Amino acid sequence: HRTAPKSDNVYLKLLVKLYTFLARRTDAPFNKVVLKALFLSKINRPPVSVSRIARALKQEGAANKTVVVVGTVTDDARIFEFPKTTVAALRFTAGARAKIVKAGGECITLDQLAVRAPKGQNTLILRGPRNSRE
Amino acid sequence: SRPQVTVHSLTGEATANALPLPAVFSAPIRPDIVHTVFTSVNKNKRQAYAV
Amino acid sequence: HFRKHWQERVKVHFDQAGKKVSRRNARATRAAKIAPRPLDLLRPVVRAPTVKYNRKVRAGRGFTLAEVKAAGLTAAYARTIGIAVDHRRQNRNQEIFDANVQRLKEYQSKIIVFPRNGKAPEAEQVLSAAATFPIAQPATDVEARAVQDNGESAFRTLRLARSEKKFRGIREKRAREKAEAE
Amino acid sequence: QVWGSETVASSKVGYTLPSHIISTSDVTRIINSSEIQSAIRPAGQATQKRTH
Amino acid sequence: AHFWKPVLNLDKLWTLIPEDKRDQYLKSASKETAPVIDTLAAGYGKILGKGRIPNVPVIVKARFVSKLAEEKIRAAGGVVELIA
Amino acid sequence: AKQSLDVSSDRRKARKAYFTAPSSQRRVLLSAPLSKELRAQYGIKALPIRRDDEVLVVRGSKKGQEGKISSVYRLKFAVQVDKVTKEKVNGASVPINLHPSKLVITKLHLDKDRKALIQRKGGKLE
RNA sequence: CAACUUUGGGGCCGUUCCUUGUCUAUGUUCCUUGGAACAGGACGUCAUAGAGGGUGAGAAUCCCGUGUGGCGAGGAGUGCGGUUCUUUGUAAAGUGCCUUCGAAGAGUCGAGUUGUUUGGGAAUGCAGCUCUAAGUGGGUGGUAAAUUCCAUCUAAAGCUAA
RNA sequence: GAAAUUGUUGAAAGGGAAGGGCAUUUGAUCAGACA
RNA sequence: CACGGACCAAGGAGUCUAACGUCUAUGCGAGUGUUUGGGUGUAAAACCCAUACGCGUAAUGAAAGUGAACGUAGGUUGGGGCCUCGCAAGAGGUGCACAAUCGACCGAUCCUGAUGUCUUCGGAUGGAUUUGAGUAAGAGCAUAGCUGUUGGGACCCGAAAG
RNA sequence: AAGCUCGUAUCAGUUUUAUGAG
């Protein structure tokens, strides 16, 4: 098992310092999953298509659940209309950071999410596919 | 708001003029990136050396 | 691919940078020698071969004899004036004919040519002419048009064209062998 | 002009400034906010008294 | 040379419209003023059908097309033009 | 600083171009300043040297001393002023090699060429 | 047939290019140590000059040089800018319309066979031997081989910058 | 101006071995603190 | 008792590169890559950049060639996490990824052979224990590091020979 | 070693019950 990360991105280490603390104190199973995802490498943090976000947003009772993606985010031309939700992730590409505000939704950071829904309340996680890998 | 910046002159004094920031200094600081750049960019001003 | 003795023949372009400076210095030298002229000959627009690239155009070698004559001058004066010529090239397309002619007309309008006798006015040269007469890829359609349909479905056309081409010799054989009956 | 802003696009070809991942480089301020601290069962002492 | 036939799925098919008239043609069913698209000028030689697309009638110009592709475009009310 | 392409910034070059330089260049390398009196007189700071010049010393152990040149030994980059000597043990005496960077002239031996030189270098001689 | 248009050759002097020669700032002030100050401290100065070297140890300011500009000297030189003397010229060139012709490289091209060579494969290139042509022709079109078209080109003679 | 190696002086030891390890004695030698 | 070792200093031996591959960090992220080259410069640097090219985004067959949604991009099961109920224990819904299974779609093999038709073309429909590393709301490109594989003298020295 | 799933987890160079082959 891992205990602390390989990277040197200082803000990434800072988020780890935060979410370790919440996983110590607050004990909701959301935070542990966040942290165990954050430690991982770039292959096993594959990106998340905004189209996939919409697919999982068409779930039942899945209209205002703030989606969370520890990985990156990728715009997708393959769909044309998109909802207006609040979406948190590490790295929003510029295309999808344009698209989501174009829909009207907000593209939020992770620390602001920790403010808004610390315990993993009214949220959801996605982990992009990994056997499109070679 | 790009909050403020003050201005001096060639003899120096806090003038009545002032300015905002450019919203570039708000950009991050990634010293890992400076490290892995600088130690790939100081080597371009190199000549050969060979017996 | 090194089973041979490659180690004596290696080229290492350290001198990329130095060649660049020598090259720019040569440019400037030739231009200051050629002081009023633009350092480059006017080169035409041409539409490329090899259907992969046929959409493009390309700044070819030299304009033609016939297009020059359509402008109403001669090659002999052109190569003094700053214009190129190819002769082994032959025009079989009218839009290109017209475009090259248009370039020549623009050039003759856009220059001033000294006498042989002199009095040498102030000229304040330009460094290049490719910039001012840029090669320009043309329009094929404005963005907007109305739809029309023909009911052919645009796949069967290609398919039966293929069929006719591959069976042309045999359909000709059928036609000829029924034609030469009795 | 040169380096871009939210209003001037970049003045470079197909370039944007980078993206923060986080609102702020501090974490003490975050955790000393209130809506987080309401969601925190309290701490220990962080120096355990020796027993036996 | 002969073998330049780099595909384009019907999916992508509006990124060719750079960003801006994308909207202006999206909010339009215009059979009178429909956008023209140049697969060849964007560097694509044959259409293949993968995607699903709005019903907005829009013009397309290309050489090679498949049956589902032309069917979907005619379903939107667009049309193919078999330029060389 | 150096903003040119035909002059050296290298030790291995200039030590050679100092040591193995001709006498015609050592004439210039063995220059000397002038007294501020002569500076006010002639309108010039410095000069080359000559056999027949009077001079005063300003640095070294021999500070305060003065006299006339008897010889200029360019092959050691040195000058020999008389009344500045060291007694050998055997009663004989030796001249003293000095660099003319560490002297100051109070009187010269002018010639036609020297007047022309001072005119060439901003002369205010008379 | 028709009217039109346009030219040359010398010198002189600048300028450019090269070779250069030469000139172009500011402390050697005070104190300590030391054999010696270029070291330490103070007080100062010049700076399109603090690159470098030297001199009795790390010297911008002691020297030579650097920088910045200028001043001349000797050469190549038509590169063009002014000059100056000649006048070609009933020469030469370009220009459209009508007509007639339009000459266009041989032991070479090409074919066989031998050997070599190429990535070149049912035979690319080269050299040798043999046979050896045509002019509404001839080569070439990477799979053989008969036939017919199509496309592009004009060989066996040649020069030349970057 | 190092080392092998060599000499003089000073100290010490020594019966067919020397060198090393644990502890200590004898002799030489030695740093720190008392305020 | 197989070999080397008298003594000391100094030297003295897994590296450098090309092309592939994994793992990781980073930039951008359906895009990606400034550097063959142009411009600019305080000059081998740094800074900017046009247009093309590469890789990837569609595969498959001997190839001619063809070419990815029936469905809320399928169903069933398990599935982290979230939501609801409950003080709780547990129940229910949603159920990403991942895995299994059943299906579908594409490409190919075999069979049928429709509307029509230059009467010999064309390929509508539906089937096979057939198959692809495919499709099924994209994920790679580039650089550096660690080490790997092959070939380069290749951990160093040392073979007679041609 | 890197991931994914479990977590009290399937297990054991082991006995006992039962029953085989030998």
Domains of chain F, with CATH numbers?
1-126 (2.30.30.30)
Interface check for D36 against chain A (CB to CB < 8 A): the answer is yes
Tally Cβ neighbours within 10 Å of residue B40. Answer: 9
Tokens for B13, please give them: 């004094």
Residues E26 and E66: beta-carbon distance below 8 Å: no
Report helix, strand or coil for F44: coil
Instruction: List the C9 CA – I159 C1' distance (angstroms).
Output: 31
What is the Cα–Cα distance from A112 to C102, expressed in whole angstroms? 62
Q: Which of C50, C140, C145 has its CB closest to that of E34? A: C145
Residues C60 and C135: beta-carbon distance below 8 Å: no
Q: Which of E35, E65, E78 has its CB closest to that of C155? A: E65
Interface check for E74 against chain A (CB to CB < 8 A): the answer is no
List CB contacts of E33: < 8 A, sequence separation 6 or more.
C144, C145, C146
Do the chains contact at C154 and E32, CB–CB below 8 Å? no
Tally Cβ neighbours within 10 Å of residue E48. Answer: 17
Instruction: List the C171 CA – I120 C1' distance (angstroms).
Output: 9
Q: Crossing angle, helix A94-103 and helix A50-57, to 10 degrees? A: 40
Interface mutation vs chain A, best among E9, E11, E19, E55, most A CBs within 10 Å: E11
One-letter amino acid at C42 equals: L
Domains of chain A by start residue, with CATH: 1-132 (3.100.10.10)
Nearest residue on chain E to C142, alpha-carbon basis: E36
What is the Cα–Cα distance from F91 to C170, expressed in whole angstroms? 131
Interface check for A80 against chain E (CB to CB < 8 A): the answer is yes
The Cα of D52 is separated from the nearest Cα of chain A by a number of Å equal to: 26
Tell me the residue length of chain A. 134
The Cα of A102 is separated from the nearest Cα of chain E by a number of Å equal to: 11
Do the chains contact at D17 and B27, CB–CB below 8 Å? yes
Report helix, strand or coil for E73: helix
Q: What is the 3-state secondary structure (H, E, C) of chain A?
A: CCCCCCCCCHHHHHHHHHHHHHHHHCCCHHHHHHHHHHCCCCCCCCCEEHHHHHHHHCCCCCCCCEEEEEEEEECCCCCCCCCCCEEEEEEECHHHHHHHHHHCCEEECCHHHHHHCCCCCCEEECCCCCCCCC
Would the Cβ of E48 be found within 7 angstroms of any atom in strand I?
A: yes
The Cα of A9 is separated from the nearest Cα of chain B by a number of Å equal to: 7
Q: Which approach determined this entry?
A: cryo-EM
Mark out chain B residues that contact chain A at CB-CB < 8 A.
28-32
Closest residue, by C-alpha, to the C1' of I58 = E7
At how many Å resolution was this determined?
3.8
Using only C-alpha atoms, what is the Rg of chain E? 12
Distance of alpha carbon E45 from its chain centroid, rounded? 12
* Nearest-5° Cα angle at E21, E19 to E27: 115
Contacts of B33 in chain D (CB under 8 A): none
Could you please report the per-residue DSSP string of C94-156? HHHHHHHHHHHHHHHHH-----SS---------S-STTTS------S--SEE-----SSTTTH
Looking at residue F32, what DSSP letter applies?
E
Among candidate residues A23, A27, A116, the one with its CA nearest the CA of residue A64 = A116
Do the chains contact at A8 and B28, CB–CB below 8 Å? no
Contacts of D29 in chain A (CB under 8 A): none
